[PDB]
Amino acid sequence: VLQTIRQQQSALNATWVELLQTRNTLNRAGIRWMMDQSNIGSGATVAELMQGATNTLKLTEKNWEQYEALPRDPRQSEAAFLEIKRTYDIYHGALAELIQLLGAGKINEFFDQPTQSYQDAFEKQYMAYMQQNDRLYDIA
């Protein structure tokens, strides 16, 4: 009912969060990488931070696949779902690419990547779709 959508919402939202956690951890690995170049390294290591971001990006893919396999109400928009998946797939792909640039030490390319646009296109769709699902609440 209003619970099949509250449950589909929560799945999607754990994808959002894990993407945002992957992104931040990766940007931590960036600082440490830069410090190591200036031999002022300290705290968490590049290798450990990359490990957590490999972790949370895999968690991201698994949270996504669970949100897809959830059922959809017919009253929900199929173009919406497909636009959610288009932006996710760019965003996740972008974070998967950050993992490679850093391992290869491509700090500028790493940092010049417009992850922020990819994320914003995905956040745009997320916010729309939660409005369309909150409406389904208002009317049930």
| List 8, 11, 15, 27, residue binding its own copies (CB under 8 A) | 27
User: Which helix (DSSP H) or strand (DSSP E) does residue 139 occupy?
Assistant: helix 115-139
List the alpha helices (DSSP H) in the chain: 2-37, 46-68, 78-103, 107-112, 115-139
Alpha-carbon dihedral 121, 124, 125, 131, rounded to 10 degrees? 180
| List 42, 74, 79, 114, residue binding Cl ion (CB under 5 A) | 114
- 55 counts as binding K ion under rule CB under 5 A: yes
Q: Which does 52 bind (CB under 5 to 8 A by kind): Na ion, Cl ion, K ion, none?
A: K ion
The site that binds its own copies (CB under 8 A) totals a number of residues, namely 34
Contact present, 45 and 80 (Cβ < 8 Å) = no
Interface with its own copies (CB under 8 A): 2-3, 6, 10, 13, 16-17, 20-21, 23-24, 27-28, 30-32, 34-35, 37-38, 40, 42-44, 107-108, 110-112, 116, 130, 134, 137-138
Q: Which residues bind K ion (CB under 5 A)?
A: 52, 55
